[PDB]
Symmetry: C3
Subunit: 523 residues, 3 copies
């Protein structure tokens, strides 16, 4: 029994169902919860000997690295795989296109299913090369930043991979932002180019996209050129001559292959803004964390198919709609529309349509379907799923049991992934087919994450279980953000200085007698 | 006997003379024709196992490659030696300078022999490094393009190698071109710099070089600086302060070594313009093709000396005057003048002077020397020669016999080489000392070249020998051109789309019972509309048969649905009467998509108009008419 | 054996390295004995590929391997080493040591006032270099650019140099004693895109103006886009130009403490160091990356006998090549601590050098004979106050060391227990050329002894231009083949490079020095042959000083020459003719030279004459001014070949009257 953790008193360990293993294509990646702690204890006491080999296994290098880990949280100088060189789009596209060009890559589901398509890895290589050819033709090169203002569709996945192909950092801007929020993000990074579309389709209603760009671009002198996709092909849309150009028109000029550009492990892969602050992520570190978590926390295999019902304007689409799954050579499902269009059975038609084996979504949608589309679940077949995931905020133990039976049929594993934009990948989450669940908890911290609670009053680490306090990590990890663009002081003041030697997550949590962490919300 | 390939009837096979092997420095690279077929068959079925090792033998790499071959013709994404890095100037200069800096590299014969000279590989490394140093200090870098407007002399070779040393792509503009032809090519490539000379010398006559550049440059805003070599040192030649700088003045400021810049295998090495279309060639694949063909088709050894009587303004000078021979580390003769100056024995005086072992020339020049200078050949010792090459057009059996008797004394091997600017290197040619000749035939296709004859109407491959049709290639090869600069769609529409799954040479050919290919003339207008091959020339004739039409012009343009579409412009309801005329005389599917009637052939203008001898005022009415 | 030519060597007892040297040596020496050295030297000459290849792979960390050890020839000016190789200078001097031992001292910084002293570990140095490199990167600095440095000899100068080299750019360090005109010359010749400087300096307790001289020069340096200013004094009265000048502490705060180093080619330029020549224009000497670094590591390791446990105190300034190679690159490459002294040997008193050695138990001390002369004159009494027993190697740099100063150095600083390394070299050699290896080569006081690895030294007859075979000889000192750390060019002026070093004696490198070789093969430097004047270790251009004096509108013509000086080694004497209080104007002209070049270029004396001796062509005959400034007027010989032989009498009278 727990005197402190009131959430822990009387909670049955929900061992992973037996049908989860009937549906695995191959022997699971970690046998039992006992091997997970042998691999975890090594990843904390011996990061060099744990992440080194994994980096060599999961990523393809253009130059080997000479030092696995360097720096400290106190000094904000973390670095991983120093001296190595790779390319993000080579690991996400090329190396799978060479292996099996016809394997699906981007299973795109448009607003209207009448506008849906699928890109094989061989097609994704030809389209990324042509868009990278355009950007290279325009003078975009390693060290530049390129803004993206696109809905959740193929064009966004291609623009990011194309920008990363040249060694430039893509700064994705959620399609729903205003001209002001566009102006602020473009000017902070001094983007030299922007990729966008004429207008989108969000649940039947068409959205003004180019209009908001033009309104914002009038205060963005750094933007030399804009690439515009024809999502609707509406001719009343204005393109300023000499600045704006058409996706289809430019890409038609360049070949289906462009060489990737090697970047250093610690070269910025992208900027993502949360005044807004631009979180910066390294290349090697972020990519490894994205691939590891997707392989272990979701139990992804070459045959699997991931449907992250998120958006690339946020970190969830970055890591688990794009980089995570494509690094592993599995197809990912890119959903442009809403969970209510045409009706509340769209998520479920798609899972049935493509036999998706993993589903990843935030609770905020589970409360929308629990309070509207609870009947549409039985229409469609959801027998392909092994793993179901929660991302956004905490997951009610109510919605947990709802998410488990209605969508999972009491046959799936459920992983409640805790993590922020600054972490890059999952921090605390239960591994599919390994970690038994406690409804409402994130469970054990992931490889390389040395979680710890700190008494906010004294600022000392709270040893022993059955306790609460501020959540903090005692060392940095590969996918940790390395700075805030052009403002490292705010980066230190926010994460590294409140508790020297620790990384301040900004949340409060509790650890029960079993070690399971309970996320008690922001402080 | 042959019912189709009449050229081949009663043609005695011509074995390589005994003197060829007496003059050969070492054992030949291929023992006999049976070893050649074994090697060729592997180059087709297993290009990875064949070209992989050769790329590691013949080229020096800064970064290893992980995949030999990628892409398909149908997708226009061919690539070779992916992930690899190298430098063209290192493989053509540095590595040979280190091994033997005193070995001759450029044997330069000037317009007047008084000005001839010889650069060793050591000399070439210093002179290339110094020019590259100037370009580098000017801001030229990987990704840029630099134009070259120079005669066929040492400075042209140095300029090309210095540009490639920085990872930039050179674009060589033949020195005979006008100011307008210069204007078009510089602007299409947006060259940041130009390398040229004040004036040229050709046949004793002074040519204006800088004068035409100044004339062109007024409309080339991308050119930031020009390097000017004092070829004549004429003091009346004006240099624009702030833009033009002297070759000798700037090179004096920089050292004789500059580190080469590594580039990717598929980074552009150069643009070569032919509306002129800028043919783009890769780095690794092109260089491997240049070395392989020069080695095996001409039988080049380190002891040899190559004289390619061509100009770097064309692909022949690119591949077989520069990259080919310098990659293999042998000396190459760079001839600045003409075959008639000071007299009609100059070619042969040069061979004798430098004891050249290999001679490579176009049939056009052989015809001129046969007509006006046959008496001069016997005056010179040409016994150093072993291989006689022919380039640019099929060689008549008569010209073949003349070439064989009067130049080779019936003692040399003759290699009629078929290829084109877009192939980078030889496609069909008799390997020196290996393949016996049939006069007028190019014989067998080369390594990596899977040649086929396809029916021009159906696009289906013709099986069996004693056949004729369109010459097409079933898979890309290392030195195949990769795109047209900033215009990959024209590249696809010209080479890959007309006959999908094949490369379209634009030539017709025939294959005899021994598998020897006989290049025929060019094929005609092939416009492919939903699988129907249409003739724009054939449609114009039909429209003109209508007594209401004075003149008619038909062209082809890209179409997202049907592949291509034919648009007919007509100079004099009526549009319906003309479309039926074409259906009856040609065929039902030959009707133009559209028939536009205008008030007033330079079709280069109609293609750009419909896509969206001079009389420029009509252009406005045609643009208005197409909309109407 | 007696010498008919090398008189310096007659009756000179050979001086073995004392026994106590090896007692204080931490490990087995890097070279077994002098016979192993001869074998290794012979291979470095006959087989440089087999010798320098392995050493380059031991001492440097490479991002890409090299395929050819050595290329090019002196005659063609195309020397190159380790071709195809890639590396980074800041990685080899910082990163690789920080990963191994982040807490090991790297920069032992002794400020002008010891109250301000501090110590940076290799870990600290990595963060501060990364932050400065981060600022430069955000400003647009990239491989191929040049960045000027105008800083005193403190930690920030070292960080600026390493941060510039981290990006693949080349730093150009401008000695802090230079005026705005000398800053102007160097920044414009190199077209520096940025400048790193400080608000004010501290030297001898007195505040020096640094930023003020930059603003004065920068008004004519249109290539400089941004300036980084360190708050050395934090004086708030120092103006920063909005849009151009930015504070070191403010900008570095914006960037993280790690930045990836940029790989550069072995032959990409590492730095420019502007040097005075026979013209009035400084020539920017350019050094490669790989070859220069290998030379710094090789010489520092084998000539000084540096081990990981050791601590090096090079009493030099990064404004000159001595600080470049043996205060920064040499010791940091080997991963040992180096003492960076910002002050003077006289402040607070004439024992400061020894307080520093004792404080930090320095094992290696490297100093100029000019300072040894000063301490013998004014501070000998201070030595007995300090424990100097940590020292074992005592070096001398920049000028000839008198046999007397050698003995003083040996007895009073080394207690007759240390090895002395008289090191001969020059800015253009990058590293040592001729020097006694510590613990290996016995000394002849005043001789540089044997040439170092890769240095094939020769003496050339000045009359015939042919190499002199056999020993007991003298002539022009020349080197028969290039070496790894040899300078590669003069910036954007390779013709001056060829005309100065390679063309005078084709097939050879021309040091500009004369020398003699005794029967034991020891070399004895006889000084410059090319009328280059060395004042307190500072290479000066008499032509540049003449130009400064003429800028005064009262001067018609001026001639400057060099003469021996008991204090500074040599002194420049200026003869001035006016167009027309003398001692007054003499002060106004000396100040004129201070304004245009720097305070350390000021003439010792200014003699005012009516006419300068001239040829019939009209050129000034400085050969006569030199013999007069010395008491060798009786060696002038026939002067009827002058166009004004009567001026000679007035020159002898003027020098006698005004010198003093
Ligand atoms: N599984 C979870 N349980 C509770 N809170 C979560 C979970 N996942 C994410 N969060 C919250 O979401 C925040 C992430 O913010 P951001 O990713 O920056 O939009 C975290 O700081 C947590 O407060
Ligand atoms: N041996 C040959 N026989 C027939 N045509 C040739 C031959 N060599 C080159 N060509 C033609 O020359 C053109 C290529 O130009 P070039 O490569 O400069 O000779 C193409 O139209 C080829 O068909
Ligand atoms: N050990 C030494 N003995 C005599 N002269 C030296 C010695 N070291 C340096 N020098 C002189 O200092 C010059 C170096 O010039 P710099 O290093 O540019 O000031 C040499 O050319 C010599 O004239
Ligand atoms: Cl090799
Ligand atoms: Cl080895
Ligand atoms: Cl000089």
């Amino acid at each position: 029994t727990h005197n402190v953790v009131h959430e822990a008193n009387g909670v049955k360990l929900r061992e992973t169902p037996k049908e989860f293993f009937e549906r695995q294509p191959n022997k699971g990646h970690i046998h039992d919860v006992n091997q997970y702690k042998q691999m975890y204890e090594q990843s904390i006491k011996d990061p060099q000997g744990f992440f080194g080999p994994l980096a060599k296994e999961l990523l393809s290098w253009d130059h080997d690295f000479h030092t696995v880990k360097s720096g400290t949280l106190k000094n904000g100088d973390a670095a991983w795989f120093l001296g190595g060189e790779l390319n993000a789009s080579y690991n996400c596209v090329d190396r799978h296109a060479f292996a099996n060009p016809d394997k699906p890559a981007l299973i795109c589901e448009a607003d209207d299913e009448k506008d849906s398509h699928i890109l094989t890895y061989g097609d994704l290589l030809r389209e990324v090369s042509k868009v990278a050819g355009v950007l290279q033709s325009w003078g975009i090169k390693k060290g530049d930043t390129v803004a993206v203002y696109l809905p959740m569709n193929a064009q966004a996945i291609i623009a990011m991979l194309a920008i990363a192909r040249l060694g430039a950092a893509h700064s994705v801007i959620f399609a729903g932002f205003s001209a002001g929020s566009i102006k602020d993000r473009v000017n902070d990074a001094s983007c030299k180019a922007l990729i966008t579309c004429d207008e989108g389709k969000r649940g039947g209603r068409t959205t003004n996209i180019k209009k908001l760009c033009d309104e914002a671009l009038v205060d963005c002198p750094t933007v030399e050129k804009v690439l515009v996709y024809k999502r609707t092909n509406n001719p009343e849309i204005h393109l300023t001559e000499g600045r704006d150009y058409y996706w289809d028109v430019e890409t038609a000029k360049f070949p289906g292959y462009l060489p990737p550009v090697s970047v250093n492990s610690e070269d910025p892969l992208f900027l993502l803004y949360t005044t807004p602050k631009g979180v910066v992520h390294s290349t090697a570190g972020y990519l490894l964390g994205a691939a590891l978590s997707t392989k272990y926390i979701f139990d992804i295999h070459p045959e699997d198919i991931l449907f992250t019902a998120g958006d690339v304007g946020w970190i969830t689409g970055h890591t688990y709609a794009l980089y995570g799954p494509l690094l592993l050579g599995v197809p990912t499902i890119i959903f442009e529309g809403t969970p209510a269009y045409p009706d509340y059975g769209r998520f479920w038609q798609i899972v049935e349509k493509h036999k998706a084996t993993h589903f990843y979504v935030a609770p905020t949608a589970l409360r929308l379907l629990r309070k509207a589309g609870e009947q549409e679940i039985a229409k469609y077949d959801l027998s392909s799923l092994r793993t179901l995931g929660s991302v956004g905020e905490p997951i009610s133990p109510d919605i947990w049991e709802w998410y488990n039976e209605f969508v999972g049929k009491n046959q799936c594993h459920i992983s409640d992934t805790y993590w922020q934009t600054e972490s890059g990948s999952h921090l605390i989450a239960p591994l599919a087919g390994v970690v038994p669940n406690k409804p409402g908890s994130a469970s054990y911290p992931f490889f390389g994450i040395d979680a710890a609670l700190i008494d906010p009053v004294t600022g000392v680490e709270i040893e022993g279980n059955d306790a609460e306090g501020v959540l903090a990590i005692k060392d940095h990890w590969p996918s940790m953000a390395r700075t805030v663009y052009k403002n490292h002081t705010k980066y230190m003041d926010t994460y590294m200085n409140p508790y020297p030697g620790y990384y301040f997550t900004g949340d409060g949590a509790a650890r029960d007698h079993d070690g399971y962490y309970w996320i008690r919300g922001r402080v």
